[PDB]
Amino acid sequence: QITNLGRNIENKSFSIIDEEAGPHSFAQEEWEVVRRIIHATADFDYKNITKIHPQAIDSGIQALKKGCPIVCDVQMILSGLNPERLKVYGCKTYCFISDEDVIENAKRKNSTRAIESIQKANSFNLLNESIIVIGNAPTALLEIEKLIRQEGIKPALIVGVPVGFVSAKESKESILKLEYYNVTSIPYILTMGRKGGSTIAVAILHALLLLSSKRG
């Protein structure tokens, strides 16, 4: 998994982050997630924009335990998750961003591959009680919002951390509006604003997998 020197570096880093982050309003478990994000980016700003839903970590753990599907918008996210830890639960990862049918459908429908990618997962019922990890494409998050609002889909958890200058900020706010209006109570983990990234998403997933293990 990692060497002694490895752990020493990480432990030293987390200690530096805690001391430097200063005062924050995150509970212990929530902080393990936020601290992980700051660690992957060296960006303390995440201490202020990462919003975690009260049931987020709980639904996340439960979903993983059940070998739930993990739907990712971009391939890099998967490339960050070690299949070793996932087979423990039997979770299955998916990313259709690069499938032919998705590509042609995006072109033909004047949309994005991310949007058709999400629709494809839905056509397979892969959104129900799953963990939706959107680390890059804002349109993928807006589509999920659309499906929740119109199709009533019920994922176990939404990790909405897309990065961008066009609709990123908006896609995250649309998720908060769903809760604001009590149309649904789908747990979420968001980094409000334009900031996000596949690396932020992977860091959140790893924090969850760790918390899951630690709960033992």
Q: Which residues are annotated as a binding site?
A: 13, 36
Per the DSSP assignment, residues forming a β-bridge with 133 are: 72, 159
Catalytic site residue from 24, 39, 53, 206: 39
* Binding-site residue positions for substrate: 13, 36
- Exposure b/e, 155-179, CB count within 10 A at least 16 = b: bbbbbbbbbbeebbbebbebbeebe
Cβ contact 74:97 at 8 Å: yes
Q: What is the 3-state secondary structure (H, E, C) of 95-141?
A: CCCCCHHHHHHHHHCCCCHHHHHHHHHHHCCCCCCCEEEECCCHHHH
Active site residue 24: no
Q: Which residue has the tokens 């129900």?
A: 128
Asked if residue 210 lies in contact with residue 61, where contact means CB atoms within 8 angstroms, the answer is: no
**What would the two tokens of residue 144 be?**
């999920």
CA 151 to chain centre: 21
CA distance 60 to 157: 6
- Report DSSP letters for 23-89, one per residue: S----HHHHHHHHHHHHHH--TTHHHHEEE-TTHHHHHHHHHHTT-EEEESSHHHHTTS-HHHHHTT
Catalytic positions, written as ranges? 39
